[model samples]
Target: TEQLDVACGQENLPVGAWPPGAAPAPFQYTPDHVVGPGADIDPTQITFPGCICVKTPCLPGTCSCLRHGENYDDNSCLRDKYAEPVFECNVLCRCSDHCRNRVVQKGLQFHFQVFKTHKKGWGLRTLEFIPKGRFVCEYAGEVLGFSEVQRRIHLQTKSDSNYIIAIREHVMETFVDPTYIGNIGRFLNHSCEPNLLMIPVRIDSMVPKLALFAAKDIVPEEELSYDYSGRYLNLTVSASKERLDHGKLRKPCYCGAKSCTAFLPFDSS
Candidate 1:
């Protein structure tokens, strides 16, 4: 009764056909990120200093949390629609609990539902009208190392849905694999032109909280997705069901967007 159920309308799915919002695979429910096999850093640990704002809304020039520019708009949605290392107020801060700068650490903003879409396995969607720029749920997972990613990719089957994300803050490597264990965030699909944007946010540490913001004003029932490539909302396509140059695989992208790239790119080496 404390934390509201993030899954919407999943209260009573059929027993045999489990609602993946309720019966997700690559299984397990984790609300936040975790240190996984071969991961070099404990992302959740506090390793940096926080602002001593002593007030709710910390301003720039004074609040180190700002670092450079203002972070959010009046609605507390990220003003940094653009990217550069985004910073947030952390527990170490003197600021009160109402601090606006601490957006991502605040957690999931709305009730999300999961449903199966033909072609695409399980899909995640929000049940409310999300205004533009609102802070949304994190793409939390068992943070992994490059070595583990290669190890797992080599083991996945041909038709598998890849659940690993590579964050290149310089080949300054960090990876999160939602493959075997995940939060509902793991169920999120990929979109050619995604509505959610991935902004790596730093809160009390160097390792970022991979936060996805409403890149657009998301409507109720709209699927929650981002550029899984963690790149621009762009790609050029190719469609060949069978090709193995060395050891790479390409699976059909079921995102259903007008600009779909036709395949999900993967490399095992």
Candidate 2:
């Protein structure tokens, strides 16, 4: 299998196939929009009721965008203490492109590789060390409605991979399907003790963008993963018992962590 050198801009950074020889997965590089057969909320239509910040740093209290509090640091990485939905300076905002709050919209900055795994199929990794709280790639794909997600799930076979992620907020929920048109984020696997953490951030619209960030310091050549269950820590006996009670189909986890749950978390809801 030939390797396809795909990069957003940096020519030196090439995303090639791993393991010497493996067929490349068919998908278009979608930097933002989702593409598939489904009806989803128009992101352009959703707007936040607030004015833009004219400040350079966009202080926590002064800026309406940072109403939830300052989300990013000097490097534009979300602080570990702030896990809330981040709202950056949107198109309506008066802030400049050099605004410190703007991070994910900048796109891929680090080197990443798409490689094959012994058990997990395809996986993503960084060729360079990733600092803690650094902004990584997004889990971008086709935005689908609940009905569309249900239909696609029903059509999937036992062996087929599930790339549809359902993100729920206080007011609304959105489904992201990256089966066809997606980025390198689709190749990210699940780990009980994952290095990456997913957060929903808003920029131009009310639609929450699924953003990935380093949970801690990640070394070079390390596989990028996150807890799909969305729970950071603490696995109670009741939760384990519930998993046993359901006895639904689950793929075995090969993360090989010392505290490996042995199986990937399954969503029964």
Candidate 3:
């Protein structure tokens, strides 16, 4: 089928394609026609929050594509990967409700396969999944100043909330949820041994946004799993143990397959 480039916000996008409604069975599948490497992100096109790359290396005029050899200009040497709908959005666009809507609409317009993962309770996973070394969704969102995020967290905590000022600071400006526009990423659930990994895609010299992609071949009924530890920068295992012990982690994790770590592990721990 020819791909439809439907603009976000139109009624043409399939219902439950993304964001609101869940993806159907065989999630993470991309079409054979669309199954290929993404276009090379010209070094000149990068842009994002923060004056310098905060979480990733700052290579202004360098390609974000995987470096396979000494020659940076060679396409075959560099490997042109396709941009899977998962993480590409986070790196390229602002994480606004409208932007979220656009991605789902665009993804649906592509007619990607849907599948159910045993891991996520109600979270949707994309099928026709992108293979390893492929570019997924970009991280797009309103870039908030660090101080501004601090102020909001301070204000939010003054009324007696479990929300930590530091934790809130990390998510600030990168991805907003004033109206729950990011319910998809929010309910993606967690796994200590996640088969999915969120890669940080850098735009220019700004803060890198989070994009989700599968790390391996996922079979039917496999629960989609992603590590939610990105928010914590330098937390210790003790901190995670404390949170899990207190039940403050909020949700019960049933990802207890032998490979499962049982509890979510801190990304930096």
Candidate 4:
């Protein structure tokens, strides 16, 4: 090599190799020798003495075949993964005496507080029953991929993710049900003039707790509703526009009611 660094000091000089690669070496496997029951002991049962096996090692500690057989189950010889079942109700919330006793009797913490809608809108805020700022229900569900959630909703059943209209297959699997206080949330009819709103807020750090609150005072039997189309749409898409111009996006509104917005909020133009 040329003597380019004529006045190099500790900082300017190279200590070792620059952009170093792997160093080549040799391989060797050597077993320690033992005394005492030499011929009588079985070689297969014998393990290295005075050592421990970790995640990196297959077998490290000293032990005999007999000992291995006894503790093999606890060891990582075989492994598997599984899913845990989700419980429906766990000590439902206690409310007024009439509500509490009925809930406890049916092993339910919440019930549908049915009501009539005064105006027509979108999402589920139809009637007035519970007082304002009261605990309604906690949003709980198995968090599945966005795809899985859509699949579940497509399945024909009363229970479905009303929020997500279409999604992938995998997202449907992960949904959790929060304990609800009334059935009004579920039975809330769709409307062009929706008075209720589903507010999504963070519970702890991970789970989302959705609470339904009346956008305004409601009378008996008024159809409650909220705009579900805002869920995945980008900000540029106007909620009212998209809902009105569904024909342009090739989506139709099945809500047969006279007040059906027809398209999503962005459908305008």
lDDT by residue (1-269, candidate 2, tens digit) is: 35566444323356766766664567776667453556456654547754456645577878888877778889877775223557877767777887777887787777888887778898998989989999888887788777777777777766777777877665467677777877778788888899987877788766667888999988989999987776754232211101111225777888888889898875643
How many residue pairs collide in each prediction? 1, 1, 54, 68
Candidates in descending lDDT order: 2, 1, 3, 4
Count: clashes, candidate 2: 1
> Lowest summed-lDDT stretch of 10 residues in model 4?
24-33
Models, CA RMSD each:
6.1, 4.4, 12.8, 31.1
Candidate 1 per-residue lDDT over residues 154-240, each given as its tens digit: 776755767777766634566777666656666778777888877778887676777789989999888888876655532222111
Best by TM-score: 2
- Give the best candidate by lDDT: 2
Task: Name model 2 segments beyond 4 Å from true.
Answer: 6-13, 35-38, 44-46, 81-83, 233-247
In TM-score terms, candidate 1 sits at 0.83
Rate residue 75 of model 4 by lDDT.
18
Minimal lDDT window, size 10, model 2: 237-246
lDDT of 4 by residue, 1-269 (tens): 43221112212221121113421111111111111121232212322232222223222132221222221123111111122111111122222222211111121122222222232222232123543323333222223343343344345233221322221121221222111211223333444455544433221122222333445545543444444443321232211111112123334445455666684342222
lDDT of 1 at 172: 58
lDDT of each: 0.68, 0.72, 0.33, 0.28
Arrange candidates by TM-score, highest first: which order? 2, 1, 3, 4
